[PDB]
């Protein structure tokens, strides 16, 4: 148990968790790993001098995690992994904030709406994009390379595959379907396979909005619909048709 670990074994783990900035301050405050556990939520925030809120939650999560002593998979993914993952889900405009808050796999799992708002992620669409990306991690038992595998192009003759497509891959897809002029608009848009395939609220119109294809270019949208549907599959197509019958009202 972490409680039996020496001051130095604790210090290096703490620093390995991207929390080495609070080191030369709380070095005298920590003799044992048990004293870390003993400390209530406030003892650490006073003594270690953790002032960023995300940083508190991070430790809190990490501690209650070692206490269960069972080995969670989302917990296996450190913060550098998550910050790479932002390139994959299509939201690299946030790497500074996430990396500075040391968002790991646990924090992804326990992600709240205010957390994301604090990291300046405010777009409804980006909350969808993140919610469905995490689903894809769940589908894949939180295996580090699940997205960071690119298989061959032809590999998509089963829609399941598309579920694991990154933002880059979707752009590569648009180019293969003669929408090269639009493919870069998806940069920073959080569009990825997980969202296209799994979110019933996400369809052709959303896609076409994000691509900057005006509502008046019927012929272009028609092309786009035809290819989008072949991409996603029959079921996913049906799922999205079905959702249209129940409008996503703002006020019940």
């Amino acid at each position: 148990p972490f409680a039996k670990w020496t001051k130095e074994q604790v210090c290096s783990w703490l620093a390995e968790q991207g929390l080495g900035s609070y080191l030369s301050s709380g070095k005298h405050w920590i003799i044992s790993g048990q004293t870390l556990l003993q400390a209530s939520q406030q003892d650490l925030e006073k003594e270690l001098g953790i002032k960023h809120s995300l940083h508190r939650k991070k430790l809190q999560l990490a501690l209650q995690a070692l206490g269960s002593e069972e080995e969670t998979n989302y917990g296996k993914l450190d913060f550098n992994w998550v910050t790479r993952w932002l390139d994959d889900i299509g939201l690299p405009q946030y790497k500074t904030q996430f990396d500075e808050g040391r968002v790991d796999g646990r924090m992804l799992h326990y992600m709240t709406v205010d957390d994301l708002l604090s990291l300046k992620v405010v777009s409804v669409l980006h909350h969808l994009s993140i919610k469905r990306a995490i689903q894809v991690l769940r589908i894949n038992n939180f295996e580090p390379n699940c997205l960071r595998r690119r298989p061959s192009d032809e590999n998509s003759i089963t829609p399941s595959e598309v579920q694991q497509w990154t933002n880059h891959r979707v752009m590569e897809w648009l180019r293969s379907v003669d929408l090269a002029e639009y493919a870069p608009n998806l940069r920073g848009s959080g569009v990825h396979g997980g969202l296209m395939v799994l979110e019933p609220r996400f369809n052709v119109e959303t896609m076409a909005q994000l691509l900057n294809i005006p509502p008046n270019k019927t012929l272009l949208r028609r092309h786009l619909a035809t290819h989008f549907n072949l991409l996603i599959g029959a079921e996913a197509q049906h799922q999205k048709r079905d959702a249209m019958e129940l409008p996503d009202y703002v006020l019940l």
């Binding site: 379907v177 003669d178 019927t218 012929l219 272009l220 092309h223 035809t226």
Partner: protein
Amino acid sequence: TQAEKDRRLKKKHELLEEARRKGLPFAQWDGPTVVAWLELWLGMPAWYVAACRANVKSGAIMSALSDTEIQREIGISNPLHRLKLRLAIQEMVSLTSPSATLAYGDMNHEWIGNEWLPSLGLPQYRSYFMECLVDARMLDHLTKKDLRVHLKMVDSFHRTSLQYGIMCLKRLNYDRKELERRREASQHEIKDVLVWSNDRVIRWIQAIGLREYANNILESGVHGSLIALDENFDYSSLALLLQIPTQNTQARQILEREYNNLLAL
């Protein structure tokens, strides 16, 4: 520099032969192929090609184009340009189907303007036809308002001239090789009148002894098919055109007999 202007033109030809010899029907041609088609076979100008390229990404789409889609999405304001496109597509859809004349640009809008229209003794309208991209296929479809408003034929007789011109191509099955071949088979003999260019008809008037008068039928719309097919068009109406005063009796009498010979043989 120009090395890359040649390579990409080859590629465009290659896409088409790849398609017409893989047997595929039009509604299944890909974007690039359809765009090649517009340039090479339809003789479409670059500005129009670029419009279609940006708004029409498949044969599937291409084949289904409505007039208002062409009008509002493609952004083609002149109705004659629109009709041009619809008709081309109309023709290509048949031509490429499981169901057993063909235009690969043989009678496109530049032959129509620089060769055919002058051949009909109508060179004065050439530019407007060009500016409207009028090809052989469209001719059959032009209305009276088209000819007056868009193509500037205020003269009803010139419209009649065009009509008979078309009636000729119809009976020739629009076969361009056969026209030019028949036209030159009869440059110095006196047989196949249906075809004769306004030029052939001038030189003939000179050969019966009316060298002064002939030159006057230059922008008149006088040609072989009018002569051969219009029952109203007799020697009297030809003389009127040649601007022969009624006093000159002998010239009229000459034309009357030689014209009837021309009609007999």
